[model samples]
Target: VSKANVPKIDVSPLFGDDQAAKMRVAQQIDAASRDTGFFYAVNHGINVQRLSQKTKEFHMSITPEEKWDLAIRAYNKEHQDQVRAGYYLSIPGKKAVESFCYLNPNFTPDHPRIQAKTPTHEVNVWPDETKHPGFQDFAEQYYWDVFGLSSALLKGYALALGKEENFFARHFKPDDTLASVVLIRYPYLDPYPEAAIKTAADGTKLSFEWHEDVSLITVLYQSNVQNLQVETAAGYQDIEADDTGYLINCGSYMAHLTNNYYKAPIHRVKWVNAERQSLPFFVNLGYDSVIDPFDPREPNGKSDREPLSYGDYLQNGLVSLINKNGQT
Candidate 1:
């Protein structure tokens, strides 16, 4: 049997009135979390035109050859090689990747990553900007778009947890130097895997696999494709893309905060008929932020969760993605 097409939730109403809308959005968030751990957010107020323009600029700036060059450079690096030893080690694997850079220059010595990870905000390998005019402008614009969406989502999450909307306000900012947006290109399989790549109703092979987002939340915007799948009680379900709507996935940080009451859903991309490309913005907390396992709402003073620093999680997550291709 085929998976059902989940309806998209319209979030425009949540912006009109402050208090009442917050309550309504909170209820919707709870329902969406319990059911699919995924949802399409509409009326998000992000500049769709600018987003589209930037994406187009990004696509035009990088060629197949450039992609291969960057990938080889990353793979050949001693540190990347050691960090990702088991992964593919040549041009073919490297050719299948693309990325852009965005860093807040105002980040200072007291920044969160200062004490945690070396080379904080210094690891990005930027493509030749002269070769790709307006690439930096677009990258910066995209960063703001994702950052705004994340902030709005956090407010909704706070209300969903029965707290004030500003519960997480102090933990993020534009200059935090904490988040990254990755543009990935997975080439079409010459002979698509018959078993690993599952077909949707339209005969398109879903290209992603089952995994959970490692950050606070993940926002995905796809280009007119229906290849994303999420695990369900019955089985994996396909998430269809609507015009300008984004697919949002819950992440591990929320899972920890909720004491596993709410889970970070496992999802994957199935192999597709054509080359598949996507933009995923990983929304994260500041590097120095400290997260407590104790749920403040719990009546008993006993904390059930372990304390973890954001930088520690970031390091582990980065290493895992580099080593495992973002797999669990």
Candidate 2:
């Protein structure tokens, strides 16, 4: 592949018992992680037909009023101040509309974490079923599907880091993971809205500003639009991929764990003249999971870096993101 292109890897071996095959996959991941911090994962075993179609259905069928009513700002105001799910408009740039949900199956209302309103461990704020049939189910199912794929890839990362394959498994409990699924829709604009037309020093029109995600990994399924770009040593490069499989990128937490051996490259979405949709599953570790660099060579396997909880890190990062007016 060219230096500008992210490599495509068939990760099927990650799910199989062939040791050599798994190692080869791990090597490829290691190279990609150290280089661009991104890769296209094919044969990753996700139901693309259902995922893409339902994604389209949700964006298409949900009305503006319904979406706004379910907005995070609106929801918290009306309810007793919950922090679970809701829509959010693109601030600074009115370029896209997005809705985020934290949908672990174990996050029922009765769950202790949900009751406590733990940082990102709250239950989802799904639309009333009678009003929006099938959406809650689709969103929850997709959340778990991507979560499983991320879990499989974490094993590959462990081997790449010279650690046992399952070394990271204990940190990603299904019930306590702070994984969030963000469904984004960028509407076509012939003349960019003034709020979104703010140009950078380099004069690139901003849809979403350049930023690195805060999760361990983000598995993105984007529709046919080549508007996404990532910064490299050579400068920024556009990423190309269809909705067939996911484009996986390492996130800030992954870099933390790897001591910067694996990068979290900055990326952005520029103005796309055509309407587009994407689902990015930000796969985080369990809410209270420890965040410390993993040193395989350490005899006792202890970290020199101060360990912290993922929940605190996530909450602080989120507040920073919003406080900076969406700049990352």
lDDT of 2 at 36: 70
lDDT tens per residue, model 1, 131-242: 8777666766667867777777777777777667776655767766466666655556555445444455545455443467778778777767666777788877767766
Please list the C-alpha lDDT of all candidates, in the order they appear. 0.62, 0.75
Best-performing candidate as measured by TM-score: 2
Clashes of 2: 0
Worst 10 residues of 2 by lDDT: 89-98
Give the candidate number with the greatest lDDT. Answer: 2
Separate clash counts for every candidate: 11, 0
Q: Estimate each model's TM-score.
A: 0.79, 0.90
Model 1 earns a TM-score of 0.79
- In model 2, which regions exceed 4 Å deviation? 1-3, 74-76, 89-95, 295-303, 325-328
